[PDB]
Amino acid sequence: MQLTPFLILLRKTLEQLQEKDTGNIFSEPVPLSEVPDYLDHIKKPMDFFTMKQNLEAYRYLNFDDFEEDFNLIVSNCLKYNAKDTIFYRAAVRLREQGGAVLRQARRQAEKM
Numbered sequence: 001m002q003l004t005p006f007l008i009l010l011r012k013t014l015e016q017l018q019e020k021d022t023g024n025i026f027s028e029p030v031p032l033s034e035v036p037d038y039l040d041h042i043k044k045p046m047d048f049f050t051m052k053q054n055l056e057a058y059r060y061l062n063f064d065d066f067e068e069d070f071n072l073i074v075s076n077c078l079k080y081n082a083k084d085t086i087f088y089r090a091a092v093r094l095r096e097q098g099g100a101v102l103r104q105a106r107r108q109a110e111k112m
């Protein structure tokens, strides 16, 4: 498998996932200045900007590398926020809509 087409695919996939986050609540790191207790609960923060930096640093060399960090975005948000919040429901919606994006993108990776 060639590296360049794979990273092109991950870039497109990351763009499609970001499009599902219409409120852009996962676009940048959770601002630790506004939620000082966040690192009490969350062992590894994640967000789409960090994912883009990891992608371009060649830290994602298989689809699981990539999907694990996406899953962290979702799971961290479900963990930190109460069920009756916009943030929690946004993570549920992203899990649902993003899972479909990822399934198709992984099938294309497997054609490489």
Ligand SMILES: Cc1cccc2sc3[nH+]ncn3c12
Residues within 6 Å of the ligand: 025, 026, 030, 031, 034, 035, 077, 080, 081, 087
């Ligand atoms: C995005 C965001 C901003 C401020 C506070 C919080 S608390 C949380 N959980 N997921 C995202 N966020 C935020």
